[PDB]
Amino acid sequence: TPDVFISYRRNSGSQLASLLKVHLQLHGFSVFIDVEKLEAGKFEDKLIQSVMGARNFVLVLSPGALDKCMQDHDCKDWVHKEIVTALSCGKNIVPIIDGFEWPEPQVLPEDMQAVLTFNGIKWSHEYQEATIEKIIRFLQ
Amino acid sequence: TPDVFISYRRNSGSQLASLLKVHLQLHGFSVFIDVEKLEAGKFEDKLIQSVMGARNFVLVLSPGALDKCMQDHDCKDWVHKEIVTALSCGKNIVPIIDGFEWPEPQVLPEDMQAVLTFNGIKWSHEYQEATIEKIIRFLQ
Ligand SMILES: CN(C(=O)N[C@@H]1COCC1(F)F)[C@H]1CCCOc2c[n+]([C@@H]3O[C@H](COP(=O)(O)OP(=O)(O)OC[C@H]4O[C@@H](n5cnc6c(N)ncnc65)[C@H](O)[C@@H]4O)[C@@H](O)[C@H]3O)ccc21
Ligand SMILES: CN(C(=O)N[C@@H]1COCC1(F)F)[C@H]1CCCOc2c[n+]([C@@H]3O[C@H](COP(=O)(O)OP(=O)(O)OC[C@H]4O[C@@H](n5cnc6c(N)ncnc65)[C@H](O)[C@@H]4O)[C@@H](O)[C@H]3O)ccc21
């Protein structure tokens, strides 16, 4: 059981997600990110179960990262599925803000609007060590 | 005198440049990147001095990273300035390709066209440890 699950958008947050993984691992956290820990089998069940296993849900909110979730009421988008799983399970959700614009709740499907109520951490390129140290304070 | 200077475009390569910085330090290299090592003074002189001082010049080629170099014949663009300094000083240039597309050399100012003749490393999101090991192989 990894302690932290990192959810991110491939096209805009892959580098920040990877950087969070390295830092969190250096500070002793077991981290789940797909490219390191998603292995053999049907990936839908493996991903969802890996969200369920992690106490902490770190959400990389790069620019436009929730765009594909909009109008995704069938829950086909994978960031959407991961967020809903995290919310449903009562995870400690820690959004990471990297140029993300806060949207109106009503543009997001009802089952994920609650993600916007969690206190988010601004990623600071100029003060990255301080950002990392704050993220660690948020983890459990 | 850091062993490695990391040159990058803020608007598209900040995260990968920081990720490279962390990994290279973890493997024992002294690294210069502006957000960690550029301190007080006239920044033009300090940056140029820092490029001249570093044996290895790691160039983060994010998508469109050399675009603002194009037709910058007064050498006002800062990536352009760092590249010309590295070329002029005969540094070990190691381009890192992250979705960057190789241009026709003549689109670049004549004083930096040679950057394309250096063997570049592909950044692989799925094989990051292998990418980092290759980068370290390339460094002196
Ligand atoms: C198992 N996967 C993998 O990628 N497996 C990779 C190999 O082993 C580990 C690995 F994850 F890196 C894919 C499976 C397809 C669903 O997408 C995800 C999503 N996520 C989680 O969602 C967030 C990212 O969502 P996202 O930015 O919207 O992604 P896209 O931009 O649509 O990328 C998806 C890319 O998968 C390609 N592809 C389609 N079929 C398969 C398949 N059978 N098998 C492999 N790829 C497939 C497709 O063509 C596209 O290019 C994150 O939070 C993340 O946890 C993890 C893994 C996958
Ligand atoms: C000292 N600097 C800093 O940034 N200093 C920062 C504070 O201490 C360390 C620090 F570097 F983070 C700036 C100075 C301005 C020139 O640009 C660079 C470039 N680089 C090297 O070039 C590559 C990045 O080139 P690039 O993606 O095109 O850049 P942009 O970000 O598009 O533009 C620059 C941004 O600097 C803002 N800004 C303008 N005035 C100043 C000033 N006095 N003082 C601070 N900022 C200024 C401006 O408004 C804009 O936003 C890389 O390879 C890099 O080595 C390093 C530092 C600076």
Side-chain angles (χ1 to χ4, degrees), chain A residues 125-139:
Chain A
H125 182 53
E126 297 203 5
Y127 306 110
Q128 291 178 47
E129 182 171 37
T131 303
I132 292 300
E133 284 163 7
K134 184 169 184 183
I135 291 163
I136 290 156
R137 284 188 308 264
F138 278 44
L139 300 173

Side-chain angles (χ1 to χ4, degrees), chain A residues 25-126:
Chain A
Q25 287 185 336
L26 288 177
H27 293 254
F29 293 92
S30 179
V31 177
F32 187 98
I33 190 178
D34 51 5
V35 286
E36 195 170 76
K37 304 270 200 195
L38 180 58
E39 291 183 341
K42 292 170 173 282
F43 57 80
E44 189 191 19
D45 309 299
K46 301 304 183 156
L47 281 165
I48 291 166
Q49 285 162 357
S50 293
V51 173
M52 296 173 168
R55 172 73 210 120
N56 302 282
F57 184 83
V58 168
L59 178 61
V60 183
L61 295 180
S62 44
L66 300 189
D67 286 7
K68 292 203 245 233
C69 315
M70 296 175 185
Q71 299 171 331
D72 175 50
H73 300 282
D74 291 340
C75 215
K76 309 188 65 175
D77 177 73
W78 260 102
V79 170
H80 181 192
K81 298 177 179 294
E82 291 175 334
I83 294 174
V84 170
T85 302
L87 290 167
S88 292
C89 295
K91 298 309 187 174
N92 185 41
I93 291 171
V94 182
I96 309 296
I97 316 303
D98 190 27
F100 176 78
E101 179 174 39
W102 290 101
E104 298 281 42
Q106 74 272 2
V107 314
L108 297 185
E110 163 157 38
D111 61 9
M112 69 170 290
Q113 293 174 4
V115 69
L116 304 177
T117 68
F118 287 83
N119 188 22
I121 295 171
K122 283 195 204 189
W123 180 263
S124 173
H125 182 53
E126 297 203 5

Side-chain angles (χ1 to χ4, degrees), chain A residues 8 10 12 14-19 21-23 26 33-35 98 123 125-126 128, chain B residues 8 10 12 14-19 21-23 26 33-35 98 123 125-126 128:
Chain A
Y8 70 104
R10 247 72 173 280
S12 63
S14 51
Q15 307 88 352
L16 179 51
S18 300
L19 183 55
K21 184 222 63 180
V22 176
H23 282 295
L26 288 177
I33 190 178
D34 51 5
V35 286
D98 190 27
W123 180 263
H125 182 53
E126 297 203 5
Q128 291 178 47
Chain B
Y8 69 105
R10 295 262 180 80
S12 62
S14 297
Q15 302 82 348
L16 181 53
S18 315
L19 180 54
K21 185 226 84 182
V22 171
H23 281 292
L26 285 178
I33 183 170
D34 54 1
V35 284
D98 190 20
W123 177 265
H125 185 53
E126 311 210 357
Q128 296 181 33

Side-chain angles (χ1 to χ4, degrees), chain A residues 126, chain B residues 5 7-10 34-35 38 43 47 78-79 82:
Chain A
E126 297 203 5
Chain B
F5 186 100
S7 172
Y8 69 105
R9 202 58 84 168
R10 295 262 180 80
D34 54 1
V35 284
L38 182 66
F43 59 82
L47 283 169
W78 258 101
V79 168
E82 295 172 341

